[PDB]
């Protein structure tokens, strides 16, 4: 009946210039462009939802081609509204520039 | 072309910084970048303030430069800057932004319903006016 999640972009991995720590990812939440605004989203569950070829079991539904890698926002990155996120498996590099959903689930408001 | 000038007595609106949202009076001018400023009736004690954070209003008070805060306050209250400011379209635009930002979820719902009905009646009258304007027949 409605979107119920914030739109985020998988910008890349936490990195130096020549080293890459793939275990954590940097996300760009839409409409969040200052560090002081990221406090709302800390600890919120985030999901990388993608499609594949083979059907997989869906909780509370028929099997379909939707898969998900779960995660959560850990802290703020930089001054411009970036956030860091840890997913249960490191995000694939093909998702860079694609959609991550920030779920509002563990709310504190 | 210019209508508002930095001058002694000119009332300015602080747009950002520690005193954002408040009115002040320019008491003196220093070094082209700052000004001795003072809001005695708006809770801004006398202090330096850059011109970059000021937005000049249309009010000008009458007091000599670097007069004491007492005389700045007397001019402010005699001119009733607080009431005159609140009656401007500038202040009412500021107030509307504030009460829109603090709108709750229920208030957003009621605004959605009121605007839904308001737009439907207006655009119905617009279509009615369009047909009346289209009913022209004269060579």
């Amino acid at each position: 009946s409605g979107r119920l999640w914030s739109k985020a972009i998988f910008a890349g991995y936490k990195r130096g210039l020549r080293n890459q720590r793939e275990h954590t990812a940097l996300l760009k939440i839409e409409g969040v462009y200052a560090r002081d605004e990221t406090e709302f989203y800390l600890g919120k569950r985030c999901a990388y939802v993608y499609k594949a070829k083979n059907n997989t079991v869906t909780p509370g539904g028929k099997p379909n081609k939707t898969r998900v890698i779960w995660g959560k926002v850990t802290r703020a990155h930089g001054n411009s509204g970036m956030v860091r996120a840890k997913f249960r498996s490191n995000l694939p590099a093909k998702a860079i520039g694609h959609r991550i959903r920030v779920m509002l689930y563990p709310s504190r408001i | 072309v210019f209508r508002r000038f930095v001058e002694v007595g000119r009332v300015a609106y602080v747009s950002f910084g520690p005193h954002a949202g408040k009115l002040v009076a320019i008491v003196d001018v220093i070094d082209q970048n700052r000004a001795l400023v003072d809001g005695p009736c708006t809770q801004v004690r006398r202090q330096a303030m850059p011109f970059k954070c000021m937005q000049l209003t249309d009010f000008i008070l009458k007091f000599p430069h670097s007069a004491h805060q007492k005389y700045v306050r007397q001019a402010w209250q005699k001119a009733d800057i607080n009431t005159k400011w609140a009656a401007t379209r500038w202040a009412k635009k500021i107030e509307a932004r504030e009460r829109k930002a603090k709108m709750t979820d229920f208030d957003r719902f009621k605004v959605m319903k009121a605007k839904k009905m308001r737009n439907r009646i207006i655009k119905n009258e617009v279509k009615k006016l369009q047909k009346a304007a289209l009913l022209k027949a004269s060579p």
Binding site: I96 | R97, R99
Partner: protein, 201 residues
């Protein structure tokens, strides 16, 4: 965002607009830049023309047909500037470069759309008013671009239709205000709700 971001190149600085655009297309956004002949470059026209002529001199001595390709249209000049800010030799950079479309003038898909503006790249705010600048359209025309005249005529014809559309828009807005005065007794109930909550002062 998810939609196509259409930008008007007029009054924008070449490298400041290109830096914003390059970051946007790396973040998975489709970006269209129109009217690339209105883009400005800081510095007087002569020293910017010298910069392009030095670019023209760079060519492969052995086989210039292999060497650097010097694109003369302002849209292709801007496109090459964005490519200089992208990692175009990787698959990620090539995908980002494919999300960018550049045009001279405003072609029919986008001449009927609203066009955004990037203030952090506008000449009016980024450049001191006493400094000099060059037009990308004039610079391109004098290094080989052949379509300055035809794009000028097509832009004038487009602006005539846009003026007609704007006059109808004003007429509809005037009729909107007249209607809003007519239905006033039955609108003030919902108007006061809007005024209370900060919409419609």
């Amino acid at each position: 965002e998810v939609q196509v971001l259409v930008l008007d190149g007029r009054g924008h600085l070449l490298g400041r607009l290109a830096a914003i655009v390059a970051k946007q297309v790396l973040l998975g956004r489709k970006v269209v830049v129109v009217r690339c002949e209105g883009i400005n470059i800081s510095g007087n026209f002569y020293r910017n023309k010298l910069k392009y002529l030095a670019f023209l001199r760079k060519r492969m001595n052995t086989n210039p047909s292999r060497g650097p390709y010097h694109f003369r249209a302002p849209s292709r000049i801007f496109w090459r500037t964005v490519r200089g800010m992208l990692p175009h030799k990787t698959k990620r950079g090539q995908a980002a470069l494919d999300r960018l479309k550049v045009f001279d003038g405003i072609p029919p898909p986008y001449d009927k759309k609203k066009r955004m503006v990037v203030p952090a790249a506008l000449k009016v705010v980024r450049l001191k008013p006493t400094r000099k600048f060059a037009y990308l359209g004039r610079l391109a025309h004098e290094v080989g671009w052949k379509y300055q005249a035809v794009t000028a005529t097509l832009e004038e014809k487009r602006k005539e239709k846009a003026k007609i559309h704007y006059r109808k828009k004003k007429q509809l807005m005037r009729l909107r205000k007249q209607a809003e005065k007519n239905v006033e007794k039955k609108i003030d109930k919902y108007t006061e709700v809007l005024k209370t909550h900060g919409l419609l002062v």
